[PDB]
Design a protein around this ligand. Structure first.
Ligand SMILES: *[C@@H]1O[C@H](CO[C@H]2O[C@@H](C)[C@@H](O)[C@@H](O)[C@@H]2O)[C@@H](O[C@@H]2O[C@H](CO)[C@@H](O)[C@H](O)[C@H]2NC(C)=O)[C@H](O)[C@H]1NC(C)=O
Ligand SMILES: *[C@@H]1O[C@H](CO[C@H]2O[C@@H](C)[C@@H](O)[C@@H](O)[C@@H]2O)[C@@H](O[C@@H]2O[C@H](CO)[C@@H](O)[C@H](O)[C@H]2NC(C)=O)[C@H](O)[C@H]1NC(C)=O
Ligand SMILES: *[C@@H]1O[C@H](CO[C@H]2O[C@@H](C)[C@@H](O)[C@@H](O)[C@@H]2O)[C@@H](O[C@@H]2O[C@H](CO)[C@@H](O)[C@H](O)[C@H]2NC(C)=O)[C@H](O)[C@H]1NC(C)=O
Ligand SMILES: *[C@H]1O[C@H](CO[C@H]2O[C@@H](C)[C@@H](O)[C@@H](O)[C@@H]2O)[C@@H](O[C@@H]2O[C@H](CO)[C@@H](O)[C@H](O)[C@H]2NC(C)=O)[C@H](O)[C@H]1NC(C)=O
Ligand SMILES: *[C@H]1O[C@H](CO[C@H]2O[C@@H](C)[C@@H](O)[C@@H](O)[C@@H]2O)[C@@H](O[C@@H]2O[C@H](CO)[C@@H](O)[C@H](O)[C@H]2NC(C)=O)[C@H](O)[C@H]1NC(C)=O
Ligand SMILES: *[C@H]1O[C@H](CO[C@H]2O[C@@H](C)[C@@H](O)[C@@H](O)[C@@H]2O)[C@@H](O[C@@H]2O[C@H](CO)[C@@H](O)[C@H](O)[C@H]2NC(C)=O)[C@H](O)[C@H]1NC(C)=O
Ligand SMILES: *[C@@H]1O[C@H](CO)[C@@H](O)[C@H](O)[C@H]1NC(C)=O
Ligand SMILES: *[C@@H]1O[C@H](CO)[C@@H](O)[C@H](O)[C@H]1NC(C)=O
Ligand SMILES: *[C@@H]1O[C@H](CO)[C@@H](O)[C@H](O)[C@H]1NC(C)=O
Ligand SMILES: [Br-]
Ligand SMILES: [Br-]
Ligand SMILES: [Br-]
Ligand SMILES: [Ca+2]
Ligand SMILES: [Ca+2]
Ligand SMILES: [Ca+2]
Ligand SMILES: [Ca+2]
Ligand SMILES: [Ca+2]
Ligand SMILES: [Ca+2]
Ligand SMILES: [Ca+2]
Ligand SMILES: [Ca+2]
Ligand SMILES: [Ca+2]
Ligand SMILES: [Cl-]
Ligand SMILES: [Cl-]
Ligand SMILES: [Cl-]
Ligand code: NA
Ligand code: NA
Ligand code: NA
Ligand code: NA
Lengths: 263, 263, 263
């Protein structure tokens, strides 16, 4: 077959995809992957070494404008309860009615003013928590339980140059330019605070690679504590002030991690 | 003397006051107070019981519009370095030139964009840290070292009704209406999120008084941890989400607490 | 170039030197030294082995007679406040006025009789603490935090043969002859107590080299405890009686180590 015919049919190998569909991805092949990877993680079968793991404050927003009803990069996407409900059907197509209601129940207890953006924000958090943030924290816990140092970050800076609208916040993929040091180029119109945030992340990443410890030792920076089971300390990355926090998304991730897999 | 003549002369009993002057206040009288109170605190001579202690995010701002040059409730008070320097002279009149420079040095290392509000914000933090926040945290540490449970809060909600301008932020005195439950009165035009914040603070205060433990046990609230030496956990009070944090103003309070008293 | 022309111009490659100038010294070359050495120390990137570290009681005095005003090997060098101030300008040429005042402030709070030698002694301690003693103790702490045994000494014996005047005390470089065992030669006019001090130091050094433990095991000597973070025990070397002490120069080194680098 022409490579085009293979590409043109990839989308259709599944009866219904979502904006998050991975139609052709890693499998347990008995070669690269010897067993179901959840089993290897749980039972400590992996390379013993240090890890650095993190997520962005609004992981799920990018996906909402690829098909969730009432969303748009070109307006504020204030959506209704009905739209939220439709959006779950878009993101959780094989899931039972009870499964989808349990998501609605966990995410729509406000908190409290009404707050036209309530449903818009909840849908981004559903998608970001389920797909990115809770699995990263779960991976980090299970990995650290076998004795290795782990460092966890929560990136919460929105790029001053971001072409996506404000409501989408600190999107998926938008720490990358900070990690590769693009704001170090003064010719590029990033702010001065961003040049500093990038320089510091660049140094922490490089110190991690060289020394297994993502500290910035020279500028009176906040010390990055290891992420342990029990305390679960993480470092926030922002332009203002680095903070040590604990138990990112504790209540949300209990939902996705212990209850949702049963549904 | 007529009480008016006493009142009219009170301001002048001091060669130079500041907006923070307490001309006639508590003294060591050998009766109510048997010794210098710093000595009693340090050496554990006080009632052994639980305490609840807290401060507001912008304690020092209220005082700046009573005489610091370039400040005004009726504009944004963007002040210069020269004005900041003059402002220290207004707030630290008996203090040596070196003392005042040490304050300038500790507070003016930015952090980094310039940031026209840099000096305005620093002066509010100088006043709030020196006068309210570091002494409260120091009191809380020394008190808890003698074995009693202590709970510390950082109030960071600006009242939607605040008549003072925005730059003054979460001012001194403006948690009080939340503590006395004024936002519980729906007729009063506080937001719904404020009614909820107040109800929860009212419950924590009442639980503290009745049970020595300022928890809100029924609504899945963040648990308020005791403030201990070493970890120094505190609870943030805000309309969005209560957080447990550590070592409020660590770098600033090291300055005021260990170095400034020598100057 | 003739080697003489290179030598003759070395002094001038810098706009102002001090008696402590190292115009051509180690650099981070990417070969011998792979990174800034403060970063390697802090992040534990060094050979894991035992160390023996020490300093002399008056490290800074030797340097004062190479240019500090009012100092002389040929009189008692009783200097004034003005001379002390001038001396800081000689030793801290690139340093801000505030930086130099902070040194004056930390070192001139007496303690208390006046004490004509006050300023003379303070200037020697400024130079010795900044340049030798606090960096050695800081090196020893950071090295020991990674698990290796460290032993720290404070040499406080003035050689009976010292050609420098008394006020200079236990100078920089004047333990060396004790370490190489020159006082073991009875023909040399060192005292008997010095022969014994040298014999014991020679044995401790040799036991350190052979066995990693600088004990003198046969003569009822004071046991030399490992220097740990937290307790910071060190051994004094003197002709009278060896003592175990703690936290050499604690107050001074807090100044140089945590505050001065900011200035
Ligand atoms: C934000 O826009 C959406 C997305 O679709 C629209 O893009 C707009 C910027 C505009 O060009 C519009 O014409 C275009 O269709 C709006 O939702 C859409 O609105 C109609 C009804 O008016 C629905 O029937 C559409 O199906 C729906 N599209 C999708 C993909 O849901 C949305 O209402 C708007 N929100 C605002 C203005 O707050
Ligand atoms: C904010 O206002 C201050 C405070 O004083 C002023 O109040 C203003 C709202 C206005 O009515 C003004 O006329 C009144 O005096 C301004 O600082 C003042 O400005 C003058 C020079 O223009 C100084 O000589 C005054 O001494 C000074 N007063 C004080 C108490 O410092 C301030 O500049 C202004 N800031 C702005 C607009 O950003
Ligand atoms: C200790 O001596 C110094 C150093 O300079 C001097 O050495 C002396 C032993 C003597 O030979 C003297 O003539 C020689 O200059 C004295 O300080 C010097 O004194 C003069 C003023 O009298 C100053 O103008 C010099 O600049 C100054 N030299 C330096 C390098 O500072 C010092 O006063 C003396 N102290 C005593 C006796 O207590
Ligand atoms: C995997 O196998 C079948 C295959 O059905 C598919 O045929 C493909 C070639 C492709 O075009 C795809 O879109 C189509 O869905 C799946 O069966 C589907 O299930 C529905 C009901 O859900 C039935 O109507 C059909 O058999 C078929 N769908 C359509 C629209 O024709 C089957 O769901 C899947 N197995 C899984 C997901 O585990
Ligand atoms: C306490 O005692 C004196 C008293 O001086 C004061 O006289 C009062 C009745 C009152 O009006 C007050 O404003 C006035 O200051 C203080 O002496 C002052 O110090 C200055 C120099 O700082 C001198 O000029 C005067 O003696 C006097 N000031 C003025 C403006 O006339 C003294 O400072 C104080 N003691 C303290 C603060 O410890
Ligand atoms: C490194 O570069 C310049 C070089 O200046 C020097 O020229 C040398 C060849 C040598 O003779 C040396 O003594 C001379 O200082 C330094 O510039 C100096 O700074 C001063 C002001 O501080 C200026 O007047 C001159 O450019 C020069 N000094 C003199 C006396 O002529 C520069 O300071 C230095 N860079 C550093 C220290 O980081
Ligand atoms: C540290 O601070 C300097 C000067 O204050 C700054 O220019 C540099 O970017 C900083 N280095 C890192 C790694 O953040
Ligand atoms: C707890 O929740 C209820 C109902 O959800 C609410 O009305 C009440 O204000 C809350 N009580 C406290 C003490 O916060
Ligand atoms: C130990 O003591 C002996 C005899 O009392 C003495 O001569 C010798 O110098 C000492 N040895 C050491 C290593 O100090
Ligand atoms: Br419904
Ligand atoms: Br200045
Ligand atoms: Br002076
Ligand atoms: Ca958040
Ligand atoms: Ca992407
Ligand atoms: Ca930092
Ligand atoms: Ca703050
Ligand atoms: Ca008030
Ligand atoms: Ca809560
Ligand atoms: Ca001494
Ligand atoms: Ca020498
Ligand atoms: Ca001995
Ligand atoms: Cl916690
Ligand atoms: Cl912490
Ligand atoms: Cl001790
Ligand atoms: Na609703
Ligand atoms: Na500036
Ligand atoms: Na200081
Ligand atoms: Na004096």
């Amino acid at each position: 077959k022409d490579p085009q015919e293979i590409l043109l049919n990839e989308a259709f190998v599944v009866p219904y995809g979502t904006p998050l569909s991975v139609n052709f991805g890693p499998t347990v092949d008995g070669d690269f992957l010897t067993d179901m990877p959840d089993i290897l993680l749980e039972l400590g079968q992996f390379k013993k070494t240090q890890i650095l793991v993190g997520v962005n404050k609004d992981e799920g927003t990018a996906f909402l404008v690829y098909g969730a009803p009432g969303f748009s990069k070109d307006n504020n996407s204030i959506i209704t309860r009905k739209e939220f409900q439709e959006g779950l059907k878009i993101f959780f197509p094989g899931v039972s009615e009870f499964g989808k209601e349990s998501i609605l129940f966990h995410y729509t207890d406000w908190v409290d003013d009404q707050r036209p953006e309530n449903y818009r924000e909840a849908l981004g958090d559903v998608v970001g928590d389920y797909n990115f943030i809770c699995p990263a924290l779960e991976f980090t816990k299970k990995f650290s339980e076998w004795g290795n140092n782990a460092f966890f970050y929560y990136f919460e800076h929105r790029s001053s140059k971001l072409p996506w609208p404000e409501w989408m916040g600190v999107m998926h993929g938008y720490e990358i330019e900070f990690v590769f040091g693009l704001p170090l180029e003064r010719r590029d119109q990033y702010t001065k605070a961003e040049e500093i945030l990038s320089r510091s992340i660049v140094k922490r990443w490089a110190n991690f690679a060289k020394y297994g410890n993502p500290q910035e030792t020279q500028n009176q920076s906040t010390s990055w504590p290891v992420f342990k089971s029990t305390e679960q300390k993480y470092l926030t990355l922002n332009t203002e002030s680095t903070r040590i926090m604990t138990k990112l998304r504790a209540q949300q991730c209990r939902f996705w991690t212990s209850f949702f897999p049963k549904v």
